[PDB]
Ligand binder design. Structure first.
Ligand SMILES: CC(C)(COP(=O)(O)OP(=O)(O)OC[C@H]1O[C@@H](n2cnc3c(N)ncnc32)[C@H](O)[C@@H]1OP(=O)(O)O)[C@@H](O)C(=O)NCCC(=O)NCCS
Ligand SMILES: CC(C)(COP(=O)(O)OP(=O)(O)OC[C@H]1O[C@@H](n2cnc3c(N)ncnc32)[C@H](O)[C@@H]1OP(=O)(O)O)[C@@H](O)C(=O)NCCC(=O)NCCS
Lengths: 383, 383
């Protein structure tokens, strides 16, 4: 049985979003108008302060006002609407995922018949056959591509798809793994109630997007393959004292979510143990001596991690950039951060794809409370 | 990192079912009585013929008549009932899965802290955090167990979990993978309509169960590990001219399924291609010279494959026995077949765990139409 030699690497990254944009300056007034909730004057001003403090300036969003006029049940606080949401999302999720995959394939530059495996994750929908089947068909992949469908992971799933891809690519000589994440927030959009600030936090922060990577071991430079990041080691853990703090449920009313106020403190108070476990085998203890690829679940998670570890403000630039332009897109977000990091490193004349550092860490955070961790190495930029 | 040498093997198998039983000879009268549909006299007689031809003698079934009396919306033909089904199934799916896992761990005989990974599949429910999280908590696994949650695969998923486990176990020295499938048909139970035989076929065939395996490379005989089957090679394919023939959708009314009359012919007309691809590299062309571990999706699938390939009656003994005593339990069913094969081989004095044969094939069939294939080797039974 022929296995590969040496580590799996990310060979290409592609991203996509719906064309329609929500400008955050306009969002409190838009949301309270389309939901027929203008009478809630005090709640609207509380919501404006949440949106202003979020550090999100714009979001892409497939759902538009004409969808809401065609089905006004979607603007109610709680109404049976899953079937309408699914009718949209079982089509749009694989379509936007295929758009990200086509951009990754173009960068990679190899024939699409060389793709041996396809991993697909989304928390926005579920169906049989799944988004993996439709994405493969829209791309014209081999019917014998080996698929890994992972519905309903949530915000840690960008780390999960890299962890799954690493073992496949290393155990199978010649394997080339296409891994894609895609979410569309029409699954969870609904109108306000007078007391429910938890619902409003989600309505302010979640946005739409897809991101795809090609992963393989033994890159062949002679045909034009080029590694961007090496995948070194992985971990997945459940934080102590964290039950129920991040949740998401598929219900008759749509996707219903739970977000506890303690989430930023729980991440920040546990993240040093994750780093010690990952980096002691490599001989590293200085968290300012590595690059970071961090899921921006909210501005408070980034601010509290930076403060707890005394990180320099260089580490989170790409996480803050993606947050500002796209909001929280669930699993795909950390892959947008990876793309921005390597692109900015080249634009700024840095020595490696990881802002001039050799070693780095990737983190995703989501339901459990689960932390996905990947130790990564950059590649030199040769000029 | 340190990778393992040699092939991954199944080291232990455990199974579980709800205690409540449906006798098939009584099911036409039970179903039409509890769904308040006795006025459909001609439909009930057609259903009696379907149940008599199904070659299912009994099924285990968590849903009972007292559940139906407490919530009569569950016996309507089509009614908004997903929330009530999920409220039951988010609890009962990880519970029944844990029961199968505990039996596999007892056979294996090693500390549960040696489990490094947990794979979970179910088509009956979906939630965040998932059934994998709850099953790991109920078992008391390490919080750092690496989880692989796969919701909504369907009837091919017993093959899928083996395919995922193989690459994890081979690429990581010391890895021990717990892989579990679990389905509970309360997700799809509903009352009849005057015309709809497709719905009734599913009401006659689907039953409840869970099955778990432990998979690892480099078994250690000195501490009591013993391989049962070696996992040699894997494939996943989509059959030509099969779009739409097997489907399942999560809707306000529950799990809604599609089953086309052409399914048995499509499988039988394509299965030889699958065998030639799997076995030509090994030098094998005689399909009666290997053992078979086949998902019994319905009696007609088995009948048409046997006829097409001129298989001897020995090949489908265990598939037919599991169908008789349990019905179609979705992804877990093929792992019940694997357990029965190795237990019967010991009881009947055969020389290997695969009915005296060296080489074998495992098949799962489900939405796509997708076929999962695994080439396996038996191990000797020696004294
Ligand atoms: C939402 C956020 C951007 C607001 O920033 P901020 O205004 O500087 O922070 P504050 O803590 O002052 O929150 C503003 C208001 O929102 C409320 N709020 C914030 N998070 C909340 C939650 N999870 N549930 C309920 N209310 C919440 C606060 O109680 C406060 O209201 P009050 O002043 O009436 O008490 C910030 O709290 C954040 O980034 N949170 C993390 C979001 C998260 O968990 N993301 C993961 C998604 S899976
Ligand atoms: C259901 C089954 C056990 C019935 O066996 P049988 O009675 O010997 O087979 P028949 O083909 O004569 O079918 C009996 C009746 O069921 C009907 N029927 C069978 N499969 C059907 C389907 N998929 N949709 C609608 N009606 C169906 C037949 O049309 C026939 O009714 P009719 O005489 O009024 O036309 C058999 O057809 C079977 O095993 N089918 C495969 C099930 C399957 O696809 N499983 C995969 C699950 S994902």
């Amino acid at each position: 049985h022929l296995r590969a030699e040496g580590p799996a690497s990310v060979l290409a990254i592609g991203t996509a979003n719906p064309e329609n944009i929500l400008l955050q300056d306009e969002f409190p007034d838009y949301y309270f108008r389309v939901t027929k909730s203008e009478h809630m004057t005090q709640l609207k001003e509380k919501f404006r302060k949440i949106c202003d403090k979020s550090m999100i300036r714009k979001r892409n969003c497939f759902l538009n006002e004409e969808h809401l006029k065609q089905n006004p049940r979607l603007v109610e606080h709680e109404m049976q609407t899953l079937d309408a949401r699914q009718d949209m999302l079982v089509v749009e999720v694989p379509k936007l995922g295929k758009d990200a995959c086509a951009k990754a394939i173009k960068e990679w530059g190899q024939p699409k018949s060389k793709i041996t495996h396809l991993i697909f994750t989304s928390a926005s929908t579920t169906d049989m056959p799944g988004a993996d089947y439709h994405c493969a068909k829209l791309l014209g992949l081999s019917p014998s591509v080996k698929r890994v469908m992972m519905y309903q992971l949530g915000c840690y799933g960008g780390g999960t798809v890299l962890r799954i891809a690493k073992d496949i690519a290393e155990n199978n000589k010649g394997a080339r793994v296409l891994a894609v994440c895609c979410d569309i927030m029409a699954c969870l959009f609904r109108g306000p109630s007078e007391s429910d600030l938890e619902l409003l936090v989600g309505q302010a922060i979640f946005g739409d997007g897809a991101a795809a990577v090609i992963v393989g071991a033994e890159p062949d430079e002679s045909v034009g393959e080029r590694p961007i990041f090496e995948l070194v080691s992985t971990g997945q853990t459940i934080l102590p004292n964290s039950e129920g703090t991040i949740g998401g449920h598929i219900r008759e009313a749509g996707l219903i979510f739970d977000l506890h106020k303690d989430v930023p403190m729980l991440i920040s108070n546990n993240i040093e143990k994750c780093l010690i476990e990952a980096f002691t085998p490599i001989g590293i203890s200085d968290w300012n001596s590595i690059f970071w690829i961090t899921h921006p679940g909210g501005k408070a998670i980034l601010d509290k991690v930076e403060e707890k570890l005394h990180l320099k403000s260089d580490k989170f630039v790409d996480s803050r950039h993606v947050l500002s332009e796209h909001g929280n897109m669930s699993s795909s977000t950390v892959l947008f951060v990876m793309d921005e990091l390597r692109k900015r490193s080249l634009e700024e004349g840095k020595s490696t794809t990881g802002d001039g550092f050799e070693w780095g860490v990737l983190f995703g955070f989501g339901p459990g409370l689960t932390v996905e961790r990947v130790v990564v190495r950059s590649v030199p930029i040769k000029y």
